[PDB]
Design a protein around this ligand. Structure first.
Ligand SMILES: *[C@@H]1O[C@H](CO[C@@H]2O[C@@H](C)[C@@H](O)[C@@H](O)[C@@H]2O)[C@@H](O[C@@H]2O[C@H](CO)[C@@H](O[C@@H]3O[C@H](CO)[C@@H](O)[C@H](O)[C@@H]3O)[C@H](O)[C@H]2NC(C)=O)[C@H](O)[C@H]1NC(C)=O
Ligand SMILES: *[C@@H]1O[C@H](CO)[C@@H](O[C@@H]2O[C@H](CO)[C@@H](O)[C@H](O)[C@H]2NC(C)=O)[C@H](O)[C@H]1NC(C)=O
Lengths: 175, 54
């Protein structure tokens, strides 16, 4: 995809994350588990909802009665009507079909971007307190219990607190 | 003319809208298919005729 995340540096999605579109998987002493990110899932569901509703809303619908009212000596008008009728069907069929094809590409790129942005959100929080494994995961240079993982997931991770413990583990890896 | 339902004669029908307070005046010395009934109409809009076997 355009943003390189979905089916890219994150290979495959998660059957085990039932409660949202994008989220986290943690792994520490206490145990592993999945958690949906609700801010970014709700935003995305807002956008896609709005997209769908606009594609339907913005259509202008008028009353029209369409029949075959011309007789056997009015074939020239009947053909004018056919050209008109057929012409609008060609227009609406092409627009609908391309509209769907084109907004289907944008919706999938939207999700790609949403996932890449979330990865970047955690990246920017953790800085060098974690190694970047490159498959969408961060290996922590410190001990990160459940309340720490929650702080990453809700955007309140305290870099300073763990900063020292982390650099002693990085210094240590330089052996 | 060719027979249609046994008949070679033809019947040709004509119509008109008669405004409120106008009069219609017939004069004929033959061949007249005269009205007995007519129809009151008010028209506030239009549609078309649908063809359906339902
Ligand atoms: C169709 O008929 C109407 C109504 O006709 C009236 O009622 C019928 C049941 C019969 O009794 C008719 O003889 C009678 O006229 C005609 O309209 C009416 O026209 C008359 C005149 O021909 C109007 O009378 C006038 O009244 C004014 C004051 O109101 C005087 O100044 C005039 O001198 C005259 O008397 C009458 O008002 C009018 N009524 C209505 C409701 O419009 C109508 O003319 C007729 N069709 C045609 C083609 O004329
Ligand atoms: C983000 O998650 C953190 C981590 O749990 C929350 O902060 C802790 O909340 C618990 C309540 O379950 C308290 O016992 C701790 O005292 C809190 N710890 C710290 C370091 O503050 C926090 O409430 C959440 N914040 C937001 C904005 O969602």
């Amino acid at each position: 995809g355009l943003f390189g995340a979905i089916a890219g540096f994150i290979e495959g999605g998660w059957q085990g994350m039932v409660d949202g579109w994008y989220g986290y998987h943690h792994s520490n002493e206490q145990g592993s588990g999945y958690a949906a990110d609700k801010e970014s899932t709700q935003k995305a569901i807002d956008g896609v909802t709005n997209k769908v509703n606009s594609i339907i809303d913005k259509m202008n619908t008028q009353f029209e009665a369409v029949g075959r009212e011309f007789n056997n000596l009015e074939r020239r008008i009947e053909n004018l009507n056919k050209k008109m009728e057929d012409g609008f069907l060609d227009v609406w069929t092409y627009n609908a079909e391309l509209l769907v094809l084109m907004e289907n590409e944008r919706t999938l790129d939207f999700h790609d971007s949403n996932v890449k942005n979330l990865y970047d959100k955690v990246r920017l929080q953790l800085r060098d307190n974690a190694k970047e494994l490159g498959n969408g995961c961060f290996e922590f240079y410190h001990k990160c219990d459940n309340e720490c993982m929650e702080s990453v997931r809700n955007g309140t991770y305290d870099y300073p607190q763990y900063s020292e413990e982390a650099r002693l583990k990085r210094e240590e890896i330089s052996s | 003319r060719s027979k249609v339902n046994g008949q070679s004669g033809r019947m040709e029908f004509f119509w008109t809208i008669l405004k409120p307070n106008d009069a219609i005046n017939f004069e004929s010395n033959g061949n007249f298919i005269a009205p007995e009934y007519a129809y009151k109409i008010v028209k506030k809009g239009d549609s078309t005729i649908m063809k359906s076997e339902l």
